[PDB]
Design a protein around this ligand. Structure first.
Ligand SMILES: OC[C@H]1O[C@@H](O[C@H]2[C@H](O)[C@@H](O)[C@H](O)O[C@@H]2CO)[C@H](O)[C@@H](O)[C@@H]1O
Ligand SMILES: OC[C@H]1O[C@@H](O[C@H]2[C@H](O)[C@@H](O)[C@H](O)O[C@@H]2CO)[C@H](O)[C@@H](O)[C@@H]1O
Ligand SMILES: [Ca+2]
Ligand SMILES: [Ca+2]
Length: 270
C-alpha cells in the first residue's frame, strides 16, 4: 500500500512509477531529483500512500556540495505526468495525451492540492514545469531550439533565470474561489529557451487550479524559437526547486494530496 523512494539509500537518482492499477502504464512518476547535489549528509524520502492518497516528501540535508554552483538551485524533487525528456521515465495513464504537439493539444485545467513547509528560510519555489521538444518522445535532454516553461505558484528567496519581460493576468481558482492573479513573465537562454511565470502573491498551501493554455500561449508569443506550434509538450512536472550556491543545509517537507488534469474543449494555444 505504500511506495517509498529514498536518497542516498536507493542511489543518487531515486525514482519510481505510481501505477495504482498495476497495468504497466504509470499514472504519475516520482523523482527525488537532487540533480545539482554532488554530496550531502542526511537524507530525502518521498512516500506515496496508494490507500490514503497522500504524497509526502521529507528532506533533511546538510553539508551540501553542489555539482555546478552556476546552476544555482540544488534539485527539484517532483512528481510528473507525461514523458520527462531528461531520462527514460514516463507516466501516460491519464486523460491528456502527453506528449502531443502544441498545435494538436486542447487546453486543460491543472488542479493541485498541496502544503509546503521549507525550514529555516530555505529558498524554494513550488513550480509546475513543461518541456517542449522537437521530437515526440525525447529521452536524452534538451537542445537550444527548445523550451522550458515554469509556473511558480509559490516562491521564497528565488527569482527566475534571465530577465523580467512583463506582467500578465491569469484567472485561477484558489481554495475554491476564482481570482484574477498576476504573474511576472521572465525569459532566459540557459542551453534552451526558458520562460517562467512567477505569481506575485505566492500561495504556500491550498487547492489551486490554473488554465494551462494561458501560460503556454504567452510562452509561444514571446518565444524566439521558430515553428513553436510544432514542438511537443512532453510532460507536466510539479515540484520544489530549492537552495542557492550559499545554502549548505536544506530541510524541507511538503505534501500533495491531489493532482488532476481536466481537458477543456478549446485549443491549448489562443
Ligand atoms: O539540467 C536541468 C535538468 O537536469 C536533469 O538532470 C539531468 C542532469 O542535468 C544531468 O547532469 C544528468 O546527467 O542527467 C540528469 C537527468 O537524469 C533534471 O532531471 C531536470 O529536472 C533538470 O531540469
Ligand atoms: O540555473 C537554472 C536555475 O536558475 C534559477 O535562477 C537563478 C539564476 O540562475 C541566477 O543567475 C539569479 O541571479 O539567481 C536565480 C535564483 O534566485 C532559476 O530560479 C531556476 O528556475 C533555474 O532552474
Ligand atoms: Ca496504470
Ligand atoms: Ca522520459
Amino acid at each position: 500500500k505504500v511506495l517509498k523512494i529514498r536518497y542516498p539509500d536507493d542511489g543518487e537518482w531515486p525514482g519510481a512509477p505510481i501505477d495504482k492499477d498495476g497495468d504497466g502504464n504509470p499514472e504519475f512518476y516520482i523523482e527525488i531529483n537532487l540533480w545539482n547535489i554532488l554530496n550531502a549528509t542526511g537524507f530525502a524520502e518521498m512516500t506515496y500512500n496508494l490507500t490514503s492518497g497522500v504524497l509526502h516528501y521529507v528532506q533533511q540535508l546538510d553539508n551540501i556540495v553542489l555539482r555546478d554552483r552556476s546552476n544555482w538551485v540544488h534539485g527539484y524533487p517532483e512528481i510528473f505526468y507525461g514523458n520527462k525528456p531528461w531520462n527514460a521515465n514516463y507516466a501516460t495513464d491519464g486523460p491528456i495525451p502527453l506528449p502531443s504537439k502544441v498545435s494538436n493539444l486542447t487546453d486543460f485545467y491543472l488542479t493541485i492540492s498541496y502544503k509546503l513547509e521549507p525550514k529555516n528560510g530555505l529558498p524554494i519555489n513550488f513550480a509546475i514545469e513543461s518541456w517542449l521538444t522537437r521530437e515526440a518522445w525525447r529521452t536524452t535532454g534538451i537542445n537550444s531550439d527548445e523550451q522550458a516553461v515554469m509556473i511558480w505558484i509559490y516562491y521564497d528567496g528565488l527569482q527566475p533565470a534571465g530577465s523580467k519581460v512583463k506582467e500578465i493576468v491569469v484567472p485561477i481558482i484558489v481554495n475554491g474561489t476564482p481570482v484574477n492573479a498576476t504573474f511576472e513573465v521572465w525569459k532566459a537562454n540557459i542551453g534552451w529557451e526558458y520562460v517562467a511565470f512567477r505569481i506575485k502573491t505566492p500561495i504556500k498551501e491550498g487547492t489551486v487550479t490554473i488554465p494551462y493554455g494561458a501560460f503556454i500561449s504567452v510562452a509561444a508569443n514571446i518565444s524566439s524559437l521558430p515553428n513553436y506550434t510544432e514542438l511537443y509538450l512532453e510532460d507536466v512536472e510539479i515540484g520544489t526547486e530549492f537552495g542557492t550556491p550559499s545554502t549548505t543545509s536544506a530541510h524541507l517537507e511538503w505534501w500533495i494530496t491531489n493532482i488532476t488534469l481536466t481537458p477543456l474543449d478549446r485549443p491549448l494555444i489562443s
